[PDB]
Design a protein around this nucleic acid. Structure first.
Ligand SMILES: O=P(O)(O)O[C@H]1[C@H](OP(=O)(O)O)[C@@H](OP(=O)(O)O)[C@H](OP(=O)(O)O)[C@@H](OP(=O)(O)O)[C@H]1OP(=O)(O)O
Lengths: 536, 501
DNA sequence: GTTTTTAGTTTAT
DNA sequence: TAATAAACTAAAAAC
């Protein structure tokens, strides 16, 4: 649904003072704001965005009456973002020389939502603050701010130059958007420690224990979708009934958990001079494929299919009657089997379905919870027949339990038909008399895998910390496309720009993993001869 | 290219004998196995050429008039009439039609039988790639009483291997077992085997003979040969295969109404005003946002897609427990070393496969299929070779290329207040789950849409009986499950659903 | 060069 | 009404 967002950015003098190697917090927050407004513009949402800057040289806000809330500027009011906003982020907006109270700027940001969402329909109201917490601030408005955020139902997020934990690499490798480093926790001041505690207390009041999860770093925000987290549109449910036989029915609702996004807009082929679509036309002609290319009119072409060497005419009318016809929408259980009999290399389709009970139906929630825990306690899964509607082709799939601490559900993935399999026989590598590696070759590979380890078992409790979670990194083709689309609009004469480095830094493993493997890779290059074949 | 496959069936006395079996005869088992290959080649629009030859019959039919060799069907594309002809030899009634049309139990000489088969490969008008003969017999010593025929059979079999013709033995069950070392050890074509002498076991069921023929009915075909780069200097060559692929309904084809002849289709682009042909340099790409137009060249719409060169860049090694099963995005692929491109790739591939299995780790890679495409993180899961009791390769050795989704591909749903069931309700569902328990196999279900589509084409191509309705094997056996559960459905209902529901 | 596959659209249920 | 899957078109790469 629609949402109203106010971006509260710090442009003070301290935002231009950084640690050697990493960019300034002003330049880091300027790319996080650019990433946010870019997706909001090129996806053409109805979300309205305002921009408040604090730390400027001047003062322009509807709260300045009486030398109050100084050095706070409302650069952009609540309206749909456009290319003029992105150009101001890219060129116009310059760093300030003053310092402003970041809680006073939050009050100005709250004033924009309270006075400009007046009649418009907004399901969510959100404020994102980009600051370094390096300046002093007053704490008298703390209870006034929380009372207004809760009465107006306004969510909050914070973005800082540093992560909310600690840093081990002493000034160390520092790359924007990389995995591992995110500003040294030893390079922060005591004023930043005081401001960070106030940020914690505000987020704990608004959100609770999970309020700490809404405090991010600029470096990690560029390789996540956290800036859009509070304004994502809600998923559509799929009502159906889970049937076991014909006398047992369970009302369920399915959601698509995994679904590839890819591009949103299509490229329209236009004339190079008029730049219009109507100047382009395609005509497809038909002619006899065999001897003598003789054209055929549409009043002489029928539909047919091939049956091996036979050519069988089959009109679309006759095809509609003899077509396979199903009853329709269903989610019927065929049987239950061991989970070991369903290997993940058999998964089919282009989606993953999470099946919950029908909303506000406790009886269906108890019935489905019995199926989930029974399959989990038996280490078994359900082989079901899935059909989206009376039109879609029926599928055979698997529904395995998924038990969490906040919800329980079944996870559906399509399974293959017999016509989808291919029994390609492959030569044995375990019983190989030609390519069996030596003892020194296995030890070099053994040393390489240990050096390139992407996990960390910290605290020695078998707790694996993923050092490179690729599922949390956004698809780089989107922000790369938004970079080029905006670059062409603002600079029509210039060619397309290269890929931003923080994109490459997030698409690469932590710098410690790459440097650790140099010595193991050198021994592998000498132990494993590799050469290209040029003869046939 | 067009591969060639000749089905050679023995017609001796033992082929029509179900020697103490709850199964069909080895002849009926071979005839039904050949029909399945004929049909499956049509389901996938395969262009291979198929032939059916019988030996040991009383009647003969070939170009050189060699006795006791009947060529039922020469090398040609499969069709509806060819499948209908093979159906005339199916079952008990088909055994009578075969013996009345050609006879059986007659003597023969395997040398003359292989000369007729090799002659079918030479008569092809099309160009051929692979030339293979598939022999169906339950006789492991055809000429143990005639050294003059067994010696000429070995010489002709050796001449086929030099010519380039492969011979695969589909040995069937024989009392006491089928002994390949007696005779067919010096006939079958093999050289890739690592001096293991494994080979398939004897076939006693139609399912086993079908899988062994299916394992050799179609040859390997790589989706792409890519470079697996440990770094910039250490590069091996791998082959990407799709062991699973969604078989879809074949698209229609336009015909000429008065002759039922296929019609060529050509699509061109011209300017609307002048009517002249439009070169690729005479048009540009456009994308309108609001009231502003963004114009890019065709070269630039592909340039923004460019990231990595085509191949697999090794990112590291992640334990298998960090790869979630519910993070499926698209069908997985299979990675196998391609020794033909980079020599020494299989040794590094095997060492990586061995150590990834011992440490339970997957090789995370940045995957780029074609040129000018954004990358996607994939996890090469180690996969050990697995053979069943028939020595059929159920699982090939290599790596399972599992696609990993980005943060955009994840979609969140609203959370419930988690309503859990009591142990009394879970116990009743446990008894229901245990009642409807079965053994799942990946080839147990057929596509009802594909089956019915080709059943309709058979009725129109042969013009015999009306199109029958296929039995949807995806529908639950409702009446059987209700009797199987009994009162377990009325139970659990009283524990969950109130009477005011 | 031809054939299978897949990303990118298209258009009806 | 939008959501989405069965159809369809086009381009890359193996054979
Ligand atoms: O840290 P991970 O081991 O990768 O755990 C992930 C992660 O959860 P947390 O970081 O909160 O522990 C996901 O969070 P996001 O991708 O949303 O940021 C969460 O996804 P949900 O928000 O949908 O719960 C997912 O859970 P799931 O994939 O079951 O939805 C969960 O993994 P586990 O289920 O293994 O804990």
């Amino acid at each position: 649904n629609k949402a109203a967002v106010v971006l509260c950015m710090d442009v003070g003098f301290t935002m231009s003072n950084s640690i050697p190697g990493i960019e300034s917090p002003f330049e880091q927050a300027k790319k996080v704001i650019t990433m946010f407004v870019q997706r909001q513009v090129f996806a053409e949402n109805k979300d309205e965005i305002a921009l408040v800057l604090f730390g400027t040289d001047g003062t322009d806000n509807p709260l300045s009456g009486g030398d109050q809330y100084q050095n706070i500027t409302v650069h952009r009011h609540l309206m749909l973002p456009d290319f003029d906003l992105l150009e101001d982020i890219e060129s116009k907006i310059q760093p300030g020389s003053q310092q402003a109270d970041f809680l006073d700027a939050l009050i100005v940001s709250m004033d924009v939502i309270q006075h400009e969402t007046i009649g418009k329909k907004f399901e969510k109201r959100h404020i994102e603050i980009f600051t370094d917490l390096s300046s002093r601030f007053s704490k008298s408005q703390l209870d006034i701010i929380i009372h207004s955020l809760k009465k107006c139902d306004i969510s909050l997020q914070f973005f800082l130059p540093f992560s909310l934990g600690k840093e081990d690499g002493s000034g160390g490798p520092f790359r924007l958007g990389g995995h591992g480093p995110s500003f040294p926790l030893k390079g922060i001041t005591e004023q930043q420690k005081e401001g960070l505690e106030i940020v914690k207390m505000v987020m704990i009041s608004l959100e609770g224990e999970d309020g700490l999860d809404e405090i991010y770093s600029f470096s990690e925000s560029l390789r996540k979708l956290c800036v859009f987290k509070k304004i994502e549109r809600h998923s559509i449910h799929w009502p159906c009934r889970l049937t076991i036989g014909s006398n047992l029915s369970i009302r369920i609702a399915a959601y698509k958990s995994i679904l590839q996004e890819r591009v949103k807009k299509t490229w329209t082929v236009v004339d190079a001079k008029t730049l219009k679509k109507e100047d382009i036309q395609k005509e497809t002609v038909y002619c006899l494929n065999d001897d003598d290319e003789t054209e055929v009119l549409k009043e002489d072409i029928i539909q047919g299919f091939r049956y091996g060497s036979d050519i069988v005419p089959f009109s679309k009318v006759d095809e509609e009657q003899m077509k396979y016809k199903s009853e329709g929408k269903c989610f019927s259980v065929l049987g239950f089997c061991k989970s070991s009999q369903v290997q993940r290399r058999f998964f089919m389709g282009n989606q993953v379905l999470k099946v919950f009970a029908a909303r506000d139906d406790e009886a269906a929630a108890v019935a489905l919870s019995s199926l989930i825990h029974a399959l989990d306690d038996l280490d078994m899964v359900a082989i079901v027949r899935y059909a989206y509607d009376k039109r879609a082709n029926p599928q055979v799939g698997v529904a395995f339990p998924h038990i969490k601490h906040n919800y329980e559900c079944l996870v559906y993935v399509q399974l293959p038909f017999m016509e989808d399999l291919r029994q390609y026989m492959f030569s044995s590598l375990k019983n190989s008399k030609k390519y069996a590696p030596t003892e020194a070759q296995l030890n070099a590979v053994d040393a390489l895998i240990d050096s390139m380890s992407l996990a960390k078992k910290d605290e020695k409790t078998d707790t694996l910390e993923d050092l490179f979670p690729t599922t949390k990194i956004p698809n780089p083709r989107f922000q790369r496309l938004f970079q080029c689309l905006l670059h062409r609009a603002l600079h029509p004469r210039e060619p397309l720009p290269p890929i931003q480095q923080h994109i490459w830094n997030m698409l690469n493993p932590p710098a410690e993993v790459t440097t650790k493997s140099q010595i193991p890779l050198s021994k592998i290059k000498t132990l494993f001869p590799l050469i290209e074949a040029k003869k046939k | 290219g067009r591969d060639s496959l000749i089905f050679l069936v023995d017609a001796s006395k033992a082929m029509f004998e179900s020697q103490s079996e709850d199964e069909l005869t080895p002849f009926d088992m071979s005839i039904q196995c050949i029909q399945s290959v004929y049909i499956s080649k049509i389901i996938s629009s395969d262009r291979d050429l198929l032939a059916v030859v019988f030996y040991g019959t009383e009647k003969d039919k070939n170009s050189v008039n060699f006795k006791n060799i009947y060529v039922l069907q020469e090398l040609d594309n499969p069709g509806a009439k060819r499948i209908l002809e093979l159906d005339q030899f199916k079952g008990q009634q088909g055994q009578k039609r075969f013996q009345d049309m050609m006879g059986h139990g007659s003597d023969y000489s395997l040398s003359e039988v292989l000369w007729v088969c090799a002659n079918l490969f030479s008569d092809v008008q099309f160009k051929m790639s692979h030339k293979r003969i598939m022999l169906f017999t339950n006789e492991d010593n055809p000429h143990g009483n005639d050294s003059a025929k067994a010696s000429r059979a070995r010489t002709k079999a050796g001449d086929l291997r030099d010519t380039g013709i492969f011979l695969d033995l589909m040995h069937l069950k024989k009392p006491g077992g089928f002994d390949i070392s007696l005779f067919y050890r010096d006939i079958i074509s093999i050289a890739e085997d690592e001096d293991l002498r494994v080979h398939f076991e004897e076939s006693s069921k139609l399912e086993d003979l079908l899988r062994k023929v299916r394992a050799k009915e179609t040859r390997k075909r790589a989706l792409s040969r890519l470079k697996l780069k440990l770094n910039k200097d250490i590069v091996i060559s791998v082959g990407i295969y799709n062991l699973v692929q969604k078989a879809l309904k074949p698209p229609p084809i336009k015909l000429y109404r008065e002759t039922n002849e296929p019609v060529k289709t050509k699509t061109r682009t011209f300017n609307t005003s002048t009517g002249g042909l439009l070169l690729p340099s005479d048009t540009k790409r456009s994308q309108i946002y609001g009231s502003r137009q963004i114009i890019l060249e065709k070269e630039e719409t592909e340039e923004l897609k460019r990231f990595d060169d085509p191949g697999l860049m090794l990112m590291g090694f992640k334990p298998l427990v960090l790869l979630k099963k519910h993070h499926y995005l698209r069908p997985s692929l299979f990675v196998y070393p391609e020794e033909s491109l980079v020599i020494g790739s299989s040794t590094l591939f095997s060492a990586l496969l061995i150590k990834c299995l011992e440490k339970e780790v997957a090789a995370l890679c940045r995957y780029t299929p074609r040129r000018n495409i954004p990358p996607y993180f994939v996890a090469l899961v180690p996969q050990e070779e697995e053979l069943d009791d028939q020595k059929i390769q159920v699982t090939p050795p290599g790596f399972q290329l599992v696609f990993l989704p980005f943060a955009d591909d994840k979609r969140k749903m609203p959370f419930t207040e988690k309503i859990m069931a009591t142990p009394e309700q879970v116990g009743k569902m446990k008894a229901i789950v245990e009642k409807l328990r079965f053994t799942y196999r990946s080839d147990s279900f057929e596509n009802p849409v594909l089956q019915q589509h080709f059943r309709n084409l058979e009725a129109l191509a042969l013009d015999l009986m009306e199109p029958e309705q296929a039995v949807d094997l995806t529908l639950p056996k409702v009446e059987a499950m209700n009797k199987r559960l009994g009162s377990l459905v009325d139970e659990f209902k009283e524990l969950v659903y109130p009477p005011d529901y």
